[PDB]
């Protein structure tokens, strides 16, 4: 099984799992740590952002790769925006403090 781009999950916006759902391979904690041990910071961010949740990022980077730019332009992973909403639903004020 192989996948470049496909459908994406409902809440988390991450790609689905399994070959029947045309799914992306799970990049697990273990696999992340490996990139952490190495240097590989761009490979990791890619895997976190334009390859998974980052909605704007993934489309923008697709366009760049057909345009042959091979530039990332990262964003904010959508699972996080949900996390925030789920913690505010608990009645905890969790704000982003700006620069």
Partner 1 sequence: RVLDATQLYLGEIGYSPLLTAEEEVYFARRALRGDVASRRRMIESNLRLVVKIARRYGNRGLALLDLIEEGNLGLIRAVEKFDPERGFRFSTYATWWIRQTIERAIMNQTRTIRLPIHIVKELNVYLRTARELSHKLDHEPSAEEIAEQLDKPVDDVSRMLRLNERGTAVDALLDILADEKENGPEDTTQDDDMKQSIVKWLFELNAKQREVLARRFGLLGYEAATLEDVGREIGLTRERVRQIQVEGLRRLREILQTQGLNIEALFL
Partner 2 sequence: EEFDAIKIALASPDMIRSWSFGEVKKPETINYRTFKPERDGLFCARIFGPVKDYECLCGKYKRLKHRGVICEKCGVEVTQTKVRRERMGHIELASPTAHIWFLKSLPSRIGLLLDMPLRDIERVLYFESYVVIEGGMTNLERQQILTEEQYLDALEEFGDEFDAKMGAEAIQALLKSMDLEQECEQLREELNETNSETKRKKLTKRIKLLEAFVQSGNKPEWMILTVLPVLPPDLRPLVPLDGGRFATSDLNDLYRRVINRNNRLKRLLDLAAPDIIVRNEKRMLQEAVDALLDNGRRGRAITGSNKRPLKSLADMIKGKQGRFRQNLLGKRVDYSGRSVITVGPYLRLHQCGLPKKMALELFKPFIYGKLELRGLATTIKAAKKMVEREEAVVWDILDEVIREHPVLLNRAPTLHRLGIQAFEPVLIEGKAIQLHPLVCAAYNADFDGDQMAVHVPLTLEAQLEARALMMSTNNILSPANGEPIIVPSQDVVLGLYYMTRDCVNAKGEGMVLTGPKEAERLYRSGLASLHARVKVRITEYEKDANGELVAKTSLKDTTVGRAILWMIVPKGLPYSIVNQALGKKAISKMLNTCYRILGLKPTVIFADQIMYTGFAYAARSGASVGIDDMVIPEKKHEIISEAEAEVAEIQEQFQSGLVTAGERYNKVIDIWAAANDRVSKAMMDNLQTETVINRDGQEEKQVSFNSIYMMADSGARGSAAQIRQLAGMRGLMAKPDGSIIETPITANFREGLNVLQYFISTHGARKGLADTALKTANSGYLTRRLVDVAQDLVVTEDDCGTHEGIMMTPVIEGGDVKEPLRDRVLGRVTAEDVLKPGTADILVPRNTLLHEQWCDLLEENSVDAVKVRSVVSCDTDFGVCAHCYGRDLARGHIINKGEAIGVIAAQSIGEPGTQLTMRTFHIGGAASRAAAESSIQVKNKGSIKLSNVKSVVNSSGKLVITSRNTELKLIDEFGRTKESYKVPYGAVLAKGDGEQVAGGETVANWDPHTMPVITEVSGFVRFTDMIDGQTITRQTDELTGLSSLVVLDSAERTAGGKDLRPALKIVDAQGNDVLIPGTDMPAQYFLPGKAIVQLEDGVQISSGDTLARIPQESGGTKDITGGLPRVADLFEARRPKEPAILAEISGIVSFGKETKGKRRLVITPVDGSDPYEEMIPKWRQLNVFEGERVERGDVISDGPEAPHDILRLRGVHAVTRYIVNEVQDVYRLQGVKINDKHIEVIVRQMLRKATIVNAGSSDFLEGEQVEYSRVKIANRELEANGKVGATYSRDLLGITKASLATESFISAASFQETTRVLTEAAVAGKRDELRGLKENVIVGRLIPAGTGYAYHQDRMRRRAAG
Partner 3 sequence: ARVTVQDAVEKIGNRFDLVLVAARRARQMQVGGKDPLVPEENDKTTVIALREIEEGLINNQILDVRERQEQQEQEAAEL
Residue selected from 7, 20, 60, 98 as contacting partner 2 according to rule CB under 8 A = 98
Backbone angles phi, psi at 17, to 5 degrees: -110, 155
d(CA 23, CA 94): 32
User: Closest distance between partner 1 and the C-beta of residue 59, in Å?
Assistant: 4
Hey, which residues between 15 and 74 contact partner 3 (CB under 8 A)?
Answer: 39, 68-71
Residue selected from 12, 23, 75, 76 as contacting DNA according to rule CB under 7 A = 23
* Other Cβ atoms closer than 10 A to 20: 8
Tell me if 2 contacts partner 1 by CB under 8 A.
Answer: no
């Amino acid at each position: 099984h192989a996948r470049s781009t496909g459908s994406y999950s409902l809440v988390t916006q991450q790609p689905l799992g399994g070959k029947a759902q045309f799914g992306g391979q799970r990049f697990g904690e273990m696999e992340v740590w490996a990139l952490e041990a190495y240097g590989a910071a761009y490979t990791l961010q890619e895997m976190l952002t334009v390859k998974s949740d980052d909605v704007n990022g993934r489309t923008k980077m697709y366009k760049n790769i057909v345009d042959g730019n091979h530039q990332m332009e990262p964003g904010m992973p959508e699972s996080f925006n949900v996390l925030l909403k789920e913690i505010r639903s608990l009645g905890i004020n969790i704000e982003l403090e700006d620069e």
